Amino acid sequence: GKLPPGPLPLPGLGNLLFQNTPYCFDQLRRRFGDVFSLQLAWTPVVVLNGLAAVREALVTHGEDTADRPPVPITQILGFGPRSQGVFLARYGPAWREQRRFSVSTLRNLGLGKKSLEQWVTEEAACLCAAFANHSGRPFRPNGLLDKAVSNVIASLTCGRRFEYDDPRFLRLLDLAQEGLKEESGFLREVLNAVPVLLHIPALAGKVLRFQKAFLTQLDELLTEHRMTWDPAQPPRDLTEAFLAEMEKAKGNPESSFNDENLRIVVADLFSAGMVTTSTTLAWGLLLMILHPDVQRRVQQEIDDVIGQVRRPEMGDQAHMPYTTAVIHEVQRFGDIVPLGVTHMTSRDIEVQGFRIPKGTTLITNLSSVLKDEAVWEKPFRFHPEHFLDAQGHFVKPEAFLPFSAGRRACLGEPLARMELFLFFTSLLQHFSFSVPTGQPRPSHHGVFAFLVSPSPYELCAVPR
Numbered sequence: 001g002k003l004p005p006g007p008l009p010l011p012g013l014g015n016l017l018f019q020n021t022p023y024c025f026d027q028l029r030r031r032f033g034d035v036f037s038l039q040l041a042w043t044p045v046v047v048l049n050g051l052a053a054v055r056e057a058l059v060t061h062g063e064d065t066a067d068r069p070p071v072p073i074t075q076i077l078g079f080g081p082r083s084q085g086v087f088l089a090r091y092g093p094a095w096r097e098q099r100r101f102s103v104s105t106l107r108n109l110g111l112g113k114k115s116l117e118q119w120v121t122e123e124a125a126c127l128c129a130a131f132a133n134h135s136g137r138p139f140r141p142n143g144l145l146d147k148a149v150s151n152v153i154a155s156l157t158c159g160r161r162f163e164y165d166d167p168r169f170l171r172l173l174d175l176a177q178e179g180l181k182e183e184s185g186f187l188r189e190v191l192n193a194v195p196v197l198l199h200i201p202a203l204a205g206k207v208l209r210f211q212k213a214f215l216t217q218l219d220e221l222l223t224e225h226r227m228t229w230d231p232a233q234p235p236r237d238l239t240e241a242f243l244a245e246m247e248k249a250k251g252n253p254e255s256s257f258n259d260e261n262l263r264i265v266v267a268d269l270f271s272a273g274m275v276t277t278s279t280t281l282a283w284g285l286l287l288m289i290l291h292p293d294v295q296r297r298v299q300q301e302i303d304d305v306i307g308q309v310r311r312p313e314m315g316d317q318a319h320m321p322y323t324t325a326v327i328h329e330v331q332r333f334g335d336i337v338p339l340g341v342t343h344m345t346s347r348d349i350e351v352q353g354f355r356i357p358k359g360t361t362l363i364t365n366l367s368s369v370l371k372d373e374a375v376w377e378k379p380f381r382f383h384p385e386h387f388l389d390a391q392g393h394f395v396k397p398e399a400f401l402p403f404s405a406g407r408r409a410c411l412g413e414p415l416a417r418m419e420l421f422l423f424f425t426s427l428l429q430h431f432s433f434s435v436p437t438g439q440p441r442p443s444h445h446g447v448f449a450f451l452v453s454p455s456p457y458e459l460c461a462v463p464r
């Protein structure tokens with residue numbers, strides 16, 4: 001077929017002609033259409049916009065678009081054929097085994113005595129207390145949200161939480177957010193393109209110094225956890241399930257259950273689960289002080305269904321359509337992963353009539369789905385009625401894809417939903433939130449850095 005249209009590529013730079021990327025892509029779509037081509041660096045890229053283009057690539061041709069672009073520098077992090085974690089794992093057996101293991105482990109920990117929900121519920125109480133200690137004073141909520149959300153992954157993975165002032169916990173979070181910044185920069189581009197340049201210790205010890213330090217701190221926690229593990233008892237957490245799997249797999253060089261993969265898998269869940277759920281909650285509180293009327297309506301629904309004393313539970317969610325709408329609207333408007341995570345074609349395919357060669361990097365423009373003017377009533381406004389009908393029933397349109405779609409769609413979504421509902425409703429249950437007086441109305445526009453964070457703001461949290 002015909003290759004997707006796009007801007008004429010320069011001789012050597014191509015289409016290279018960061019902080020404003022999601023805006024630039026919205027301009028190219030209106031200019032060239034829902035499926036267009038770019039030559040970013042030395043990589044051939046196809047951008048997909050709208051639900052139809054994204055679905056066709058990820059669902060209809062799901063088998064041919066489930067791969068990731070190779071990332072040579074991950075060799076520095078201990079990556080190998082049977083140890084690719086989940087997130088950046090090439091499509092194949094090493095990815096599928098670990099994908100099925102996390103999906104299933106999350107499922108099992110979410111059933112029975114409901115340990116995940118219990119961990120989340122306790123973490124919310126801790127988060128509430130930490131908020132109450134700021135009573136009367138404006139503060140940035142971001143740090144505390146990070147800690148609460150990081151402890152939930154800590155609970156999932158190592159069966160413990162950490163105190164909010166614990167030294168190692170703090171360094172761990174610090175290294176994780178520094179490591180995120182290392183995802184951006186020209187360096188990793190050149191290094192992934194010309195991997196032989198990695199033999200220069202100057203460049204190799206710089207490209208992933210924070211992620212490598214992040215992993216070092218994790219090992220120390222895994223080493224401790226390995227001492228306390230009781231293999232005579234059912235696995236309490238994901239690391240123990242993994243460890244048990246690793247024992248059975250001793251002698252099998254085909255297994256992806258090994259020590260090198262364990263640290264990558266745990267780091268993946270932290271990386272994937274921290275900044276997303278936290279940033280989203282940070283969007284949520286911002287939108288609640290920018291729109292206090294919505295806040296009050298949520299608080300009314302909370303009193304009528306839950307009360308001012310009892311802790312929110314997940315069974316409440318089905319009886320709180322307005323709060324559910326709002327939380328979905330926080331995700332849709334917040335749009336925290338506008339360009340998602342890159343896929344690669346493992347086979348020539350057809351999308352919207354155009355030919356996509358094998359080995360093409362696909363960018364799924366999720367933002368273009370969440371903000372589609374054809375689908376949403378007022379996509380650039382915060383509008384909880386995007387998820388309500390006239391009767392007040394919660395409705396989830398198909399264009400709600402903040403977790404992407406197909407085989408690689410967020411494996412964390414059920415946990416994320418749980419965290420968003422329990423943290424959000426718990427906070428609004430006990431506190432009224434507002435902009436501090438004599439401070440400027442905070443911007444509803446985010447800052448892009450792969451992830452989109454709300455603009456820095458402070459709030460007041462007043463007990464109810």
Ligand code: HEM
Nearest residue numbers: 087272273276277280340341403404408409410411412416
């Ligand atoms: C508000 C919360 C979250 C959002 C918006 C979000 C969003 C995303 C997106 C866009 C992807 C890429 C899908 C693709 O490649 O097409 C992804 C993948 C992933 N997420 Fe999430 N995520 C969230 C929370 C979490 C949590 C809590 C966990 C873990 C407990 C998690 C674990 C993962 C993993 C492991 C992947 C890689 C899946 C794979 O490649 O097979 N995420 N997420």
Ligand SMILES: C=C[C@H]1CN2CC[C@H]1C[C@H]2[C@H](O)c1ccnc2ccc(OC)cc12
Nearest residue numbers: 087088183268271272276337340341450451
């Ligand atoms: C891309 C895969 C790996 C590289 N980074 C650390 C481990 C893995 C996760 C990712 C980063 O934490 C991260 C978290 C959540 N959403 C992301 C979305 C995009 C991204 O880079 C474009 C990095 C993201």
Ligand SMILES: [Zn+2]
Nearest residue numbers: 158159236237
């Ligand atoms: Zn344990």
Ligand SMILES: [Zn+2]
Nearest residue numbers: 389391392393
């Ligand atoms: Zn209805």
Ligand SMILES: [Zn+2]
Nearest residue numbers: 429430463464
């Ligand atoms: Zn209270």
